[PDB]
Amino acid sequence: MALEICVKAAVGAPNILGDCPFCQRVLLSLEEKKIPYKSHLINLGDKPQWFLEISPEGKVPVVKIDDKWVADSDVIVGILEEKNPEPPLATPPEFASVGSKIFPSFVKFLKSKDPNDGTEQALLEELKALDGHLKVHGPFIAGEKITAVDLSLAPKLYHLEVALGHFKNWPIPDNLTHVLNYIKLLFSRESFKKTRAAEEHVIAGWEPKVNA
């Protein structure tokens, strides 16, 4: 019965969330559904021994759906948006084609040993290719409503705004007229606003993950 979820505790502050935007996806779909769940803050620097019985890689996120474990957040989202008591949302439209390039390229932006100044010249055209069709639909990165492309990207855009803001506060121009207003929606709803990490505890989670 029920839903139990294991998620990133902050570095040094085990009672709050820190850097794992992949955990923030799982909170986002549960809070869009408003469905009852139970959350377990895992310290990744000192992992509970029983946590390997839930996640064989020792990673977060991992969940229990009806007490049965599921790891990796794109698989966890795939099962939650297909096999749950609230309506299923596992429908990827055309926005998943560009969004699946943005998905790793915005993690590589936060790991830009390979220059971000050269990478950004592709990211502006990735954002234009998404935004040019999203401005026909209006509100969300999957179109008229939240589906898999918001669940793939929404916490990663807020994580870029915070963690890239610490050294290269990269502006979204008003020509990206969906993207620049969609970032303001991350401070709203149950689905985005409840999932917002403490912003120092994103930055102090992300620094060693420029390397690791």
With binding defined as CB under 6 A, does residue 140 bind ligand GSH? no
Do residues 131 and 178 lie in contact, with contact meaning Cβ atoms separated by under 8 Å? yes
The residue from 17, 20, 146, 149 that is catalytic is 20
Q: What are the residues whose beta carbons fall under 8 Å from the beta carbon of 36, sequence distance 6 or more?
A: 2, 3
Exposed (0-12), middle (13-18) or buried (19+): which is 88, by Cβ within 10 Å? exposed
- Is residue 35 at the binding interface for ligand GSH, with CB under 6 A as the rule? no
* Rounded least distance, CB 92 to ligand GSH, Å: 16
* β-bridge pairing 68-71 and 3-8: unpaired
Residue closer to ligand GSH by CB (options 143, 155) is 155
| Distance linking the first and last C-alpha atoms of the chain | 36
**Pick 74 or 207: Cβ nearer ligand GSH:** 74
Angstrom CA distances, 90 to 22, 58, 130, 134, stand at 17, 26, 19, 19
Q: Which of 3, 5, 7, 20 binds ligand GSH (CB under 6 A)?
A: 20
Least spacing, CB of residue 72 vs ligand GSH, in Å: 4
Q: Does 195 help bind ligand GSH (rule: CB under 6 A)?
A: no
The answer to whether residue 20 is catalytic is yes
> What positions carry a catalytic annotation?
20
Residues that bind ligand GSH (CB under 6 A): 20, 22, 44, 59-61, 72-74
